[PDB]
Amino acid sequence: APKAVLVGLPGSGKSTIGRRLAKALGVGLLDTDVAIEQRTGRSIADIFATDGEQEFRRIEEDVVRAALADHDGVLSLGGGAVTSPGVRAALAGHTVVYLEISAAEGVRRTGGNTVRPLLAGPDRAEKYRALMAKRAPLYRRVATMRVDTNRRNPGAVVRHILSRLQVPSPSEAATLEHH
Numbered sequence: 001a002p003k004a005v006l007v008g009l010p011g012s013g014k015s016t017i018g019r020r021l022a023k024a025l026g027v028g029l030l031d032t033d034v035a036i037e038q039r040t041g042r043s044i045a046d047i048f049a050t051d052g053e054q055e056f057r058r059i060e061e062d063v064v065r066a067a068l069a070d071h072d073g074v075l076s077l078g079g080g081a082v083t084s085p086g087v088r089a090a091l092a093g094h095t096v097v098y099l100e101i102s103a104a105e106g107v108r109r110t111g112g113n114t115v116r117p118l119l120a121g122p123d124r125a126e127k128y129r130a131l132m133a134k135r136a137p138l139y140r141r142v143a144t145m146r147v148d149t150n151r152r153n154p155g156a157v158v159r160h161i162l163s164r165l166q167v168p169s170p171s172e173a174a175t176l177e178h179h
């Protein structure tokens, strides 16, 4: 089972923290969006367009369940995986690290806001706020550790997670005595 499953909004650091945490632990890194494309030979966009969001979520859930069973390192989850009740069920018992971010920081870290085509319509920042409103309660539900990334740099985020993921060695005493 994974040492940590990372969840959070776009820009929260799933890729950056995934890589740095996996490096610090000396473990493998799997990202579920990448794994979907690798397992299907279809792009994420193509699956959504052709099959619809529900079938995307079906394929995603199967990939997530496989990774939770088979992967021993760091796993990062696609943003929408937690919308599936079956993914939330599958996660229970795992170490699930929710990388928290504000809307303004998430917008900044994903390339900034956009032009607002109509005064009466949304911009990117508003769409992001909506995503946050729908997703954040689900990440809070599934989490076993929550880490604020707004004012911690990646190294500080990784140190914070590491400090809460420690594994005592049952062979510690014998290693001092000999090994």
Ligand SMILES: Nc1ncnc2c1ncn2[C@@H]1O[C@H](COP(=O)(O)OP(=O)(O)O)[C@@H](O)[C@H]1O
Binding pocket: 008, 009, 010, 011, 012, 013, 014, 015, 016, 017, 109, 110, 149, 150, 152, 153, 154, 157
């Ligand atoms: N804790 C952090 N502090 C500052 N910048 C960060 C932090 N985490 C990620 N970033 C930056 O934000 C951007 C998006 O990070 P990324 O890891 O791609 O997010 P995600 O995979 O969750 O969308 C990258 O430019 C990355 O360097």
Ligand SMILES: [Cl-]
Binding pocket: 160
């Ligand atoms: Cl800290």
